[PDB]
Design a protein around this motif. Structure first.
Motif, mmCIF file in Angstrom:
data_model
loop_
_atom_site.group_PDB
_atom_site.id
_atom_site.type_symbol
_atom_site.label_atom_id
_atom_site.label_comp_id
_atom_site.label_asym_id
_atom_site.label_seq_id
_atom_site.Cartn_x
_atom_site.Cartn_y
_atom_site.Cartn_z
ATOM 1 N N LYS A 255 -14.180 9.189 -15.138
ATOM 2 C CA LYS A 255 -13.827 8.326 -16.260
ATOM 3 C C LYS A 255 -12.312 8.306 -16.462
ATOM 4 C CE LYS A 255 -16.425 10.767 -18.975
ATOM 5 N NZ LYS A 255 -17.183 11.100 -20.209
ATOM 6 N N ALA A 256 -11.669 9.444 -16.221
ATOM 7 C CA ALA A 256 -10.221 9.537 -16.325
ATOM 8 C C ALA A 256 -9.553 8.703 -15.237
ATOM 9 C CB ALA A 256 -9.780 10.990 -16.235
ATOM 10 N N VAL A 257 -9.967 8.942 -13.998
ATOM 11 C CA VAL A 257 -9.433 8.235 -12.841
ATOM 12 C C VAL A 257 -9.668 6.730 -12.954
ATOM 13 C CG1 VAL A 257 -9.643 7.927 -10.336
ATOM 14 C CG2 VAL A 257 -9.694 10.224 -11.309
ATOM 15 N N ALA A 258 -10.855 6.348 -13.418
ATOM 16 C CA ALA A 258 -11.229 4.939 -13.534
ATOM 17 C C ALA A 258 -10.236 4.151 -14.381
ATOM 18 C CB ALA A 258 -12.627 4.808 -14.115
ATOM 19 N N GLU A 259 -9.667 4.796 -15.394
ATOM 20 C CA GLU A 259 -8.720 4.132 -16.282
ATOM 21 C C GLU A 259 -7.297 4.198 -15.731
ATOM 22 O OE1 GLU A 259 -9.719 2.429 -19.542
ATOM 23 O OE2 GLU A 259 -11.157 2.432 -17.886
ATOM 24 N N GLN A 260 -7.082 5.058 -14.744
ATOM 25 C CA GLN A 260 -5.762 5.206 -14.136
ATOM 26 C C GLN A 260 -5.613 4.259 -12.947
ATOM 27 O OE1 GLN A 260 -3.498 7.947 -15.867
ATOM 28 N NE2 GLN A 260 -5.024 6.695 -16.923
ATOM 29 N N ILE A 261 -6.744 3.901 -12.341
ATOM 30 C CA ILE A 261 -6.767 2.977 -11.202
ATOM 31 C C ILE A 261 -6.034 1.659 -11.511
ATOM 32 C CG2 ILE A 261 -8.232 1.615 -9.653
ATOM 33 C CD1 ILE A 261 -10.368 3.769 -9.937
ATOM 34 N N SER B 233 1.692 6.889 -10.881
ATOM 35 C CA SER B 233 1.279 7.651 -9.711
ATOM 36 C C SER B 233 1.062 9.117 -10.070
ATOM 37 C CB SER B 233 2.335 7.535 -8.611
ATOM 38 O OG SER B 233 2.540 6.183 -8.242
ATOM 39 N N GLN B 234 2.050 9.709 -10.729
ATOM 40 C CA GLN B 234 1.983 11.112 -11.112
ATOM 41 C C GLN B 234 0.914 11.337 -12.177
ATOM 42 O OE1 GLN B 234 6.209 13.022 -11.080
ATOM 43 N NE2 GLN B 234 6.533 10.850 -11.508
ATOM 44 N N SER B 235 0.706 10.331 -13.016
ATOM 45 C CA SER B 235 -0.329 10.383 -14.037
ATOM 46 C C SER B 235 -1.713 10.320 -13.393
ATOM 47 C CB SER B 235 -0.150 9.225 -15.028
ATOM 48 O OG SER B 235 -1.096 9.291 -16.081
#
Length: 138
Positions: free
Chosen positions: A51-57, A84-86
């Motif tokens: 869920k975290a990654v999905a919003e960072q994509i 990127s770092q986030s």
């Protein structure tokens, strides 16, 4: 002569494949989830990171598209670099979790799929992490 984008060049490319590989890893991780049914809270680190990654994509791709449009813009540069770092922070977690969740996945399809996905994401982060590094401190 030929002066290319440089630094942001690798950011664009790494972030694209990162965003791609991340989406694939998410789709595999939460497809099975290596969470036991008997407990008081077995929340899989996969899904929490998914869920975290999905919003960072989208942020990656937003940064990418920004860099494509304005490679000579510090605003777009730092945006991509920061994004990127986030992304690395929760992304790396999902990679670490994935590899350890593979042997604990009951569904063979998901297990093998997650293996390949995390292998892609890990290498995608390998690029992105080094990419943003070079673009930031140079």
């Amino acid at each position: 002569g030929i002066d290319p984008f440089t630094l942001v060049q690798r950011l664009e490319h790494a972030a694209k494949q990162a965003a791609a590989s991340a989406t694939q890893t998410i789709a595999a991780a939460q497809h099975a989830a290596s969470a036991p049914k008997a407990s008081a809270g077995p929340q899989p680190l996969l899904v929490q990171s998914c869920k975290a990654v999905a919003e960072q994509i989208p942020l990656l791709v937003q940064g990418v598209r920004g860099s494509q449009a304005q490679p000579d813009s510090p605003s777009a540069q730092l945006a991509l670099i920061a994004a990127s770092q986030s992304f690395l922070q929760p992304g790396g977690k999902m990679v670490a979790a994935a590899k350890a969740s593979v042997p604990t996945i009951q569904d063979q399809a998901s297990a093998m799929q997650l293996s390949q996905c995390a292998k892609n994401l890990g290498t995608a982060l390998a690029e992105l992490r080094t990419a943003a590094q070079k673009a930031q401190e140079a």
